[PDB]
Enzyme design. Structure first.
Site, mmCIF file in Angstrom:
data_model
loop_
_atom_site.group_PDB
_atom_site.id
_atom_site.type_symbol
_atom_site.label_atom_id
_atom_site.label_comp_id
_atom_site.label_asym_id
_atom_site.label_seq_id
_atom_site.Cartn_x
_atom_site.Cartn_y
_atom_site.Cartn_z
ATOM 1 N N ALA D 12 60.968 43.801 6.755
ATOM 2 C CA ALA D 12 61.673 44.183 5.530
ATOM 3 C C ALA D 12 62.856 43.259 5.258
ATOM 4 C CB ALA D 12 62.137 45.638 5.609
ATOM 5 N N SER D 140 65.324 46.986 8.063
ATOM 6 C CA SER D 140 64.854 48.346 7.822
ATOM 7 C C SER D 140 65.405 49.295 8.890
ATOM 8 C CB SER D 140 63.322 48.411 7.815
ATOM 9 O OG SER D 140 62.778 48.182 9.112
ATOM 10 N N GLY D 143 61.491 50.250 11.299
ATOM 11 C CA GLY D 143 60.749 49.384 12.192
ATOM 12 C C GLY D 143 61.403 49.266 13.564
ATOM 13 N N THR D 145 61.854 46.463 15.318
ATOM 14 C CA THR D 145 62.779 45.334 15.282
ATOM 15 C C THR D 145 63.969 45.637 14.381
ATOM 16 O OG1 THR D 145 60.933 43.812 15.685
ATOM 17 C CG2 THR D 145 62.962 42.841 14.829
ATOM 18 N N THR D 179 55.303 53.294 7.377
ATOM 19 C CA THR D 179 54.442 52.580 8.311
ATOM 20 C C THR D 179 54.274 53.258 9.666
ATOM 21 O OG1 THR D 179 56.055 51.171 9.467
ATOM 22 C CG2 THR D 179 55.410 50.519 7.246
ATOM 23 N N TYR D 224 55.001 45.478 -2.150
ATOM 24 C CA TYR D 224 56.266 45.031 -1.581
ATOM 25 C C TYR D 224 56.940 43.998 -2.474
ATOM 26 C CZ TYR D 224 55.730 47.487 2.923
ATOM 27 O OH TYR D 224 55.610 48.443 3.918
ATOM 28 N N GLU D 254 87.351 42.874 0.849
ATOM 29 C CA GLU D 254 87.572 43.622 -0.387
ATOM 30 C C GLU D 254 86.570 44.757 -0.549
ATOM 31 O OE1 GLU D 254 88.429 41.998 -4.319
ATOM 32 O OE2 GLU D 254 89.553 40.327 -3.433
HETATM 33 N N1 LIG Z 1 61.498 47.782 0.495
HETATM 34 C C1 LIG Z 1 60.782 47.213 1.462
HETATM 35 N N2 LIG Z 1 60.485 47.920 2.603
HETATM 36 C C2 LIG Z 1 59.763 47.344 3.585
HETATM 37 C C3 LIG Z 1 59.305 46.045 3.464
HETATM 38 N N3 LIG Z 1 58.629 45.756 4.605
HETATM 39 C C4 LIG Z 1 58.647 46.840 5.424
HETATM 40 N N4 LIG Z 1 59.339 47.842 4.790
HETATM 41 C C5 LIG Z 1 59.674 49.184 5.297
HETATM 42 O O1 LIG Z 1 60.178 48.971 6.606
HETATM 43 C C6 LIG Z 1 59.751 49.998 7.476
HETATM 44 C C7 LIG Z 1 58.845 49.345 8.521
HETATM 45 O O2 LIG Z 1 59.634 48.471 9.275
HETATM 46 P P1 LIG Z 1 59.487 46.881 9.315
HETATM 47 O O3 LIG Z 1 60.726 46.183 8.785
HETATM 48 O O4 LIG Z 1 58.247 46.389 8.651
HETATM 49 O O5 LIG Z 1 59.303 46.754 10.913
HETATM 50 P P2 LIG Z 1 59.947 45.605 11.826
HETATM 51 O O6 LIG Z 1 61.448 45.496 11.634
HETATM 52 O O7 LIG Z 1 59.229 44.331 11.496
HETATM 53 O O8 LIG Z 1 59.701 46.141 13.338
HETATM 54 P P3 LIG Z 1 58.283 46.010 14.149
HETATM 55 O O9 LIG Z 1 57.203 45.443 13.261
HETATM 56 O O10 LIG Z 1 58.030 47.389 14.658
HETATM 57 O O11 LIG Z 1 58.509 44.993 15.276
HETATM 58 C C8 LIG Z 1 58.975 50.991 6.634
HETATM 59 O O12 LIG Z 1 59.852 52.009 6.208
HETATM 60 C C9 LIG Z 1 58.513 50.138 5.467
HETATM 61 O O13 LIG Z 1 58.290 50.874 4.283
HETATM 62 C C10 LIG Z 1 59.612 45.318 2.314
HETATM 63 O O14 LIG Z 1 59.227 44.150 2.151
HETATM 64 N N5 LIG Z 1 60.344 45.917 1.327
HETATM 65 C C1 LIG Z 2 43.804 54.230 8.480
HETATM 66 O O1 LIG Z 2 44.843 53.529 9.150
HETATM 67 C C2 LIG Z 2 44.551 53.070 10.422
HETATM 68 C C3 LIG Z 2 43.231 52.959 10.873
HETATM 69 C C4 LIG Z 2 42.982 52.500 12.156
HETATM 70 C C5 LIG Z 2 44.061 52.153 12.976
HETATM 71 O O2 LIG Z 2 43.828 51.680 14.253
HETATM 72 C C6 LIG Z 2 42.766 50.735 14.400
HETATM 73 C C7 LIG Z 2 45.385 52.260 12.525
HETATM 74 C C8 LIG Z 2 46.538 51.898 13.408
HETATM 75 N N1 LIG Z 2 47.723 52.702 13.064
HETATM 76 C C9 LIG Z 2 47.631 54.180 13.089
HETATM 77 C C10 LIG Z 2 48.788 54.860 12.411
HETATM 78 C C11 LIG Z 2 48.782 56.249 12.219
HETATM 79 C C12 LIG Z 2 49.861 56.901 11.586
HETATM 80 O O3 LIG Z 2 49.803 58.280 11.420
HETATM 81 C C13 LIG Z 2 48.842 58.986 12.207
HETATM 82 C C14 LIG Z 2 50.969 56.152 11.128
HETATM 83 O O4 LIG Z 2 52.095 56.707 10.504
HETATM 84 S S1 LIG Z 2 52.428 56.784 8.893
HETATM 85 N N2 LIG Z 2 51.371 57.918 8.216
HETATM 86 O O5 LIG Z 2 52.212 55.464 8.293
HETATM 87 O O6 LIG Z 2 53.786 57.295 8.678
HETATM 88 C C15 LIG Z 2 50.977 54.769 11.331
HETATM 89 C C16 LIG Z 2 49.899 54.129 11.962
HETATM 90 N N3 LIG Z 2 49.945 52.694 12.142
HETATM 91 C C17 LIG Z 2 48.819 51.982 12.645
HETATM 92 O O7 LIG Z 2 48.797 50.738 12.698
HETATM 93 C C18 LIG Z 2 45.624 52.724 11.240
#
Ligand SMILES: Nc1nc2c(ncn2[C@@H]2O[C@H](COP(=O)(O)OP(=O)(O)OP(=O)(O)O)[C@@H](O)[C@H]2O)c(=O)[nH]1
Ligand SMILES: COc1ccc(OC)c(CN2Cc3cc(OC)c(OS(N)(=O)=O)cc3NC2=O)c1
Ligand SMILES: Nc1ncnc2c1ncn2[C@@H]1O[C@H](COP(=O)(O)OP(=O)(O)CP(=O)(O)O)[C@@H](O)[C@H]1O
Ligand SMILES: Nc1nc2c(ncn2[C@@H]2O[C@H](COP(=O)(O)OP(=O)(O)O)[C@@H](O)[C@H]2O)c(=O)[nH]1
Ligand SMILES: [Mg+2]
Ligand SMILES: [Mg+2]
Ligand SMILES: [Mg+2]
Lengths: 421, 316, 54, 437
Positions: D12, D140, D143, D145, D179, D224, D254
């Site tokens: 993000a 974010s 996530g 990270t 996610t 996105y 500020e």
């Molecule tokens: N507004 C906005 N939200 C984003 C974007 N990419 C990811 N998100 C949000 O960020 C959260 C997911 O975290 P990320 O920033 O993708 O995860 P990360 O920091 O890369 O951490 P990991 O992948 O777990 O190593 C979720 O709430 C997403 O909806 C973006 O490009 N724009």
């Molecule tokens: C249809 O999608 C998939 C199909 C096959 C999959 O494995 C091969 C994955 C892998 N998964 C599962 C998953 C479940 C969640 O809920 C149960 C979730 O949480 S959520 N609702 O986004 O908030 C986040 C994730 N992230 C993932 O990569 C996703």
């Protein structure tokens, strides 16, 4: 998180594994010789997850084929896509395992396991960033069940920080080869409880019921069941193989498994295999229907902890969201409330072969306890008379190991009942 | 089907409403803490409005307006009438009131009492001499029913929907006394069903609008509509339009409706005075079915439709 | 309604409108928490390997 | 002149950073190759835009930015994107294995291995500054990270740059664009660990951006890219004071002086108007009064909440385009007569106003239409506490059963950190209740 190392063990494990590679090779445009002849670039973007690239622009599956007898692997090598596998990745013995968990886990399997580990190490060492392993096997026999679980334990010892994923086929007296299948299955389930992160439970009872009642097949064969299994396996690996907005095995485990032992998933698929395409409400309704479940458990007898659902084809994202929210809101009683937003939906534009749209379901449901209960009962009916035990004590096992396996299984059942209430 | 939850087991009105919704066949009740609902019959206190309107794909509705407590608490009602320019204290239908703590209005209340006492005046306090919360003027000259020489109050029920339409239920209730009013025992000064319990003139010390209207005709040669209802509708309209900008859910991520119980007093010159506003009122047994069904039709099905009106729409 | 501190430049201007007057953990400590977490991961992994050896 | 360094963490933070720097280049007349034909001082200068761009002898204007992610897919987009010539390879830092949506994995297991490299690249940027102000940190909440590594990095930055200010742009999670099911855990853990190290943080709820894209831009399923272009317009109005000539919010301190009266309550609410679709060949141009009025509609806020039920501690109005002070003051008078704007009694009831004459810039071919005037309001209101409550409740639902906790303990964390973080959040909600009454 890139490469996945695939392992298939025993008769069942090698037959469904061969079908899996045939199907996904067709999806990515890879011919039996390992040459790419596709039209789109989306099929090559993440092809390294399952395929190594050898000089000459050839793609070789990162797959290891294991068995204690050569027959099934001989038939694989002569199969449709038999030429595509790496010849050194065939590891086999001659004795067989006799549908006996002790022979696969303690006597015959122990000799071959180190050779398998050598091939696993050779494949892992060429990985830019290994994610983990996926294993196909059955639990009712001897090699896939006994040697398969032995292999899982050794792999965990050498690679303790990688994910372990299995497709495990559960026995049923309706589709049975030997009376000792409940013994082998009970011994294996304890191993899976300790040493896998994700297990897809493929119940032969459900596969038979689908072929008989829904597909209208009076006499289902193992091929008819393996058609369903390969369709399901393609479905559940779709988001690992194609550019997805999410996936990998670790994020799957993190999002699907709230308690470490409760990692046994109930899969589903729709439509069940003509020229008319299904509408989105039909896909969503069928995908949540018990008759489309690959484990013989009624989801209305338990609750969903987490759910993942994949839609494949060109369709309306808005309609998919509306239908998924629809089924959640209209069946909210069968979802636990203490895990917010526990249903995840993904869409992939590339449909599988011969279908314009499809949907695949992955559920972590407490109703899976029914499966374990069934096996437990069949175990006990024999074990209280110690029937057929000499096949196992003759390989060095003691009755105590059986008593402990049974206790561990009933503990798993009671844990599911605990979170169901 | 549609989805609703229940979070107040002490509400007779909304117990009947939920029972009717279950008698529809298109509504189903959930566990009280299930967040995926279309309609919430919420609790009286600490209703978590902040958690509403964040469920994807759900139109969510609640049977309370956040911020309407300003009208339904006595000290805050006084403060609202005094400090709102739309009411400006100079309104003729609310008694002279002051809020006192045990800013404070003690000096001002005693100040005006100094001008009032020399002449008389009797006051009342809740939440003839000042030396012996909210303190307001006690209406010493109420309209008394005959035979009996007894006082009463008027209860009107008002429904405000998600569009801020104001509906006045056509049926009100006079809650009467039984003992003759003595302006020299507080039972004759206090009108309450529980306090009265009695039941000689009418059943339950409550008289309905057809009978009271016939009494106004025969005794005072006027009608309930002309002598009283114009004033009641004016007061209701003023109170609710005043706070409309503070509580309206017109552009909000969830929607509100609410049922109010207005309480009025009538003096012997047929002037209507607003006594108080109730935010969680009860009802009359003869009116539970009609009023609750009207709540379903006008408040609920208007947002969640299914497969003469009993309300008077107070235009504004 | 008092406007105060008006500043004007070729790119724009700024000002204030008033309507009513009024009525750290050290580096060593961070290293300590990180290393403690790493030690806990190590202890859990040693217990696993002991179990597998049994 | 004093420099600001931008740091983008996780998917993000990185994607939003790309959108922002693209918009900056369009605004200042910098081409994708880094050349700036309007800059007559070649190879140097202390102009306003130099707070965000350094200069090479060849005339290239290079962003003072670093991009960090534990997986290489997202930063590889920057490496081959339109503005690839803008950045040097040392500014782009990637790992091999991401945090798998696990705060503990990002903060402990993986963060310990890369924090020194990240700080070393940041130090390389600081060595080129003659008077560094501080850092702007994009990430974010949800996530692994964005939550875990950012909290670690913020601690180290407080240690190594004690007197520098640090501002955040934080993406608050929404199930519409979610996610992972554990995002509440990560949000609470990172807020607890970061609270003491951040001087001012602008939260953006993905639910609000999603709804604005669907409603005002008529986009049925926002991507996105849509979300990030809208967000980048918001960020641009917030940092324009640092990048252009002016008198209001010309340095990071500020922001704290103007928006944050108490250290812990440092989360201002942003509201932006107007958002109009490019598809419409004609739309009516909203006046100063109309966009100022729009600043008080919940549907235009960056976080959904009801400011009518809270109290204000400060309010800043940031205009761009054809705007003169007379219209701003008239509009404010109208809003005061027509709305409920209650301040705490220990703060003045004033509005700080800034006006940039250059109208907003939009990406060509994008979804946002070109408008003659726009405004971003930054107000510090207790009503934003609603978002905390929502989040905390979801936390309480999972943690009561200890669902998913073993994944964090497995990385070296202790259960005590969960309850410690939750107690800090409960104290924060208490602070907001005390100030808001
Ligand atoms: N507004 C906005 N939200 C984003 C974007 N990419 C990811 N998100 C949000 O960020 C959260 C997911 O975290 P990320 O920033 O993708 O995860 P990360 O920091 O890369 O951490 P990991 O992948 O777990 O190593 C979720 O709430 C997403 O909806 C973006 O490009 N724009
Ligand atoms: C249809 O999608 C998939 C199909 C096959 C999959 O494995 C091969 C994955 C892998 N998964 C599962 C998953 C479940 C969640 O809920 C149960 C979730 O949480 S959520 N609702 O986004 O908030 C986040 C994730 N992230 C993932 O990569 C996703
Ligand atoms: N200023 C006044 N003048 C005359 N009578 C008054 C009065 N204030 C109160 N009363 C009498 O006291 C009764 C109750 O006063 P109050 O306003 O507190 O009702 P209440 O809150 O106790 C129960 P409810 O919810 O039905 O109103 C009124 O019905 C009326 O008869
Ligand atoms: N679905 C399916 N099940 C099989 C297949 N082959 C064997 N089984 C089942 O697997 C169990 C027998 O174990 P098997 O794999 O043949 O023994 P192994 O070679 O020792 O691993 C029984 O439950 C069989 O019904 C197959 O091709 N498909
Ligand atoms: Mg066999
Ligand atoms: Mg009362
Ligand atoms: Mg990432």
């Amino acid at each position: 998180m890139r490469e996945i190392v695939h392992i298939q063990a025993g008769q069942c494990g090698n037959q469904i594994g061969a079908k899996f590679w045939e199907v996904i090779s067709d999806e990515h445009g890879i011919d039996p010789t390992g040459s790419y002849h596709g039209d789109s670039d989306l099929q090559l973007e993440r092809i390294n997850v399952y395929y190594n690239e050898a000089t000459g622009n050839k793609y070789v599956p990162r797959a290891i084929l294991v068995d204690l007898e050569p027959g099934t692997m001989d038939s694989v090598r002569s199969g449709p896509f038999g030429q595509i596998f790496r010849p050194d990745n065939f590891v086999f013995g001659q004795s067989g395992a006799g549908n006996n968990w002790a022979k696969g886990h303690y006597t015959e399997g122990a000799e071959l396991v180190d050779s398998v580990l050598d091939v696993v190490r050779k494949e892992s060492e060429s990985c830019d960033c290994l994610q983990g392993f996926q294993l196909t096997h059955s639990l009712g026999g001897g090699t896939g069940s006994g040697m398969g679980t032995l292999l899982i334990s050794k792999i965990r010892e050498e690679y303790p920080d990688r994910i372990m994923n299995t497709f495990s086929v559960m026995p049923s007296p309706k589709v049975s080869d030997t009376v000792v299948e409940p013994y082998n299955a009970t011994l294996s389930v304890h191993q899976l409880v300790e040493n896998t992160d994700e297990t897809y439970c493929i119940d032969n009872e459900a596969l038979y019921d689908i072929c008989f009642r829904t597909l209208k097949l009076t006499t289902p064969t193992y091929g008819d069941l393996n058609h369903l299994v390969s369709a399901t396996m393609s479905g559940v690996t779709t988001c690992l193989r194609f550019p997805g907005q999410l996936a990998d095995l670790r994020k799957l485990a993190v999002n699907m498994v709230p308690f470490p032992r409760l990692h046994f998933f109930m899969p589903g698929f729709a439509p069940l295999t003509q020229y008319r395409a299904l509408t989105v409400p039909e896909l969503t309704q069928q995908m949540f229907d018990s008759k489309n479940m690959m484990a013989a458990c009624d989801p209305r007898h338990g609750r969903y902890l987490t759910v993942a659902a994949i839609f494949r084809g060109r369709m309306s994202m808005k309609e998919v969201d509306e239908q998924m929210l629809n089924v959640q809101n209209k069946n909210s009683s069968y979802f636990v409330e203490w895990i917010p937003n526990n249903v995840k939906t993904a869409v992939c534009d590339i449909p599988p072969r011969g279908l314009k749209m499809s949907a695949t379901f992955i559920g972590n449901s407490t109703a899976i306890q029914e499966l374990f209960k069934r096996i437990s009962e069949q175990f006990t009916a024999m074990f209280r008379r110690k029937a057929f035990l000499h096949w196992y004590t003759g390989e060095g096992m003691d009755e105590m190991e059986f008593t402990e396996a049974e206790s561990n299984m009933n503990d798993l059942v009671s844990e599911y009942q605990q979170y169901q209430d | 089907m549609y989805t609703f939850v229940v979070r107040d087991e002490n509400s007779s009105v909304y117990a009947e409403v939920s029972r009717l919704l279950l008698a529809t066949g298109q509504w189903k009740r959930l566990r009280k803490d299930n967040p995926r609902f279309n309609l919430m019959l919420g609790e009286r206190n600490r209703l978590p409005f902040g958690r509403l309107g964040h469920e994807p794909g759900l139109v969510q509705l609640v049977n309370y307006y956040r911020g309407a407590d300003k009208l339904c608490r006595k000290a805050s009602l006084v403060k609202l009438i005094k400090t709102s320019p739309e009411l400006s204290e100079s309104c003729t239908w609310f008694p002279e009131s002051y809020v006192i703590y045990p800013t404070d209005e003690r000096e001002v209340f005693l100040a005006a009492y100094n001008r009032r006492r020399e002449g008389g005046n009797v006051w009342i306090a809740k939440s003839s001499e000042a030396s012996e919360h909210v303190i307001q003027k006690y209406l010493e000259k109420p309209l008394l029913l005959e035979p009996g020489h007894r006082k009463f109050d008027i209860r009107s029920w008002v429904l405000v929907d998600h569009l801020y339409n104001i509906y006045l239920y056509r049926e009100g209730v006079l809650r009467t006394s039984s003992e003759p009013y003595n302006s020299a025992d507080k039972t004759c000064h206090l009108t309450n069903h529980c306090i009265q319990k009695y039941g000689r003139y009418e059943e339950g010390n409550e008289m309905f609008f057809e009978e009271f209207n016939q009494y106004l005709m025969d005794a005072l040669n006027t009608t309930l509509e002309n002598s009283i209802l114009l004033q009641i509708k004016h007061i209701i309209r003023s109170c609710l339009m005043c706070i409309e900008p503070a509580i309206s859910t017109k552009h909000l991520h969830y929607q509100s409706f609410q049922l109010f119980g207005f309480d009025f007093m009538v003096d012997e010159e047929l002037k209507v005075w607003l006594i108080e506003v109730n935010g969680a009122p009860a009802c009359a047994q003869k009116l539970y079915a009609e009023l609750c069904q009207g709540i379903v039709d006008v408040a609920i099905s208007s947002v969640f439709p299914l497969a003469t009106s009993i309300f008077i729409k107070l235009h504004h | 309604m008092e406007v105060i501190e008006l500043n004007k430049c070729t790119s724009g201007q700024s000002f204030e409108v008033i309507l009513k007057p009024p009525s750290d953990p050290s580096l060593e400590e961070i290293q300590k928490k990180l290393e403690a977490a790493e030690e806990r991961r190590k202890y859990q992994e040693a217990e696993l390997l002991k179990h597998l050896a049994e | 002149m004093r420099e600001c360094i931008s740091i983008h963490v996780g998917q993000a933070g990185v994607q939003i950073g790309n959108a922002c720097w693209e918009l900056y280049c369009l605004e200042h007349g910098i081409q994708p190759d880094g050349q700036m034909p309007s800059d007559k001082t070649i190879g140097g200068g202390d102009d306003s835009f130099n707070t965000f761009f350094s200069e090479t002898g060849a005339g290239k204007h290079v962003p003072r930015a670093v991009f960090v992610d534990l997986e290489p897919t997202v930063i590889d987009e920057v490496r081959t994107g339109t503005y690839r010539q803008l950045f040097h390879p040392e500014q782009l830092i990637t790992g091999k294995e991401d945090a798998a949506n696990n705060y503990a994995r990002g903060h402990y297991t993986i963060g310990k291995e890369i924090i020194d490299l990240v700080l070393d690249r940041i130090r390389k940027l600081a060595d080129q500054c003659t008077g560094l102000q501080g850092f702007l940190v994009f990430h974010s909440f949800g996530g692994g990270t964005g939550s875990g590594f950012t909290s670690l990095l913020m601690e180290r930055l407080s240690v190594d740059y004690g007197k520098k200010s640090k501002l955040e742009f934080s993406i608050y999670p929404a199930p519409q664009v979610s996610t992972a099911v554990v995002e509440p855990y990560n949000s609470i853990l990172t807020t607890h660990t970061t609270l003491e190290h951040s001087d001012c943080a602008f939260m953006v709820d993905n639910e609000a951006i999603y709804d604005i894209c669907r409603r005002n831009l008529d986009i049925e399923r926002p991507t996105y890219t849509n979300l990030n272009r809208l967000i980048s317009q918001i960020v641009s109005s917030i940092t324009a004071s640092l990048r252009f000539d002016g008198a209001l919010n010309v340095d990071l301190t500020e922001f704290q002086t103007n928006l944050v009266p108490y250290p812990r309550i440092h989360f201002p609410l942003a509201t932006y108007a107007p958002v109009i679709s490019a598809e419409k060949a004609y739309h009516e141009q909203l006046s100063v009064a109309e966009i100022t009025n729009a600043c008080f509609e919940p549907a235009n806020q960056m976080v959904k909440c009801d400011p009518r039920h809270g109290k204000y501690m400060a309010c800043c109005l940031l205009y761009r385009g054809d705007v003169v002070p007379k219209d701003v003051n008239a509009a404010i008078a109208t809003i005061k007569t027509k709305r409920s704007i209650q301040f705490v009694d220990w703060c003045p009831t004033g509005f700080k106003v800034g006006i940039n004459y250059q109208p907003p810039t939009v990406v060509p071919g994008g979804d946002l239409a070109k408008v003659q005037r726009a405004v971003c309001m930054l107000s510090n209101t207790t009503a934003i506490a609603e978002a905390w409550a929502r989040l905390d409740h979801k936390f309480d639902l999972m943690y009561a059963k200890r669902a998913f906790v073993h994944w964090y303990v497995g990385e070296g964390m202790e259960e005590g950190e969960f309850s410690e973080a939750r107690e800090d959040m409960a104290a924060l909600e208490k602070d907001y209740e005390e100030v808001g009454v």
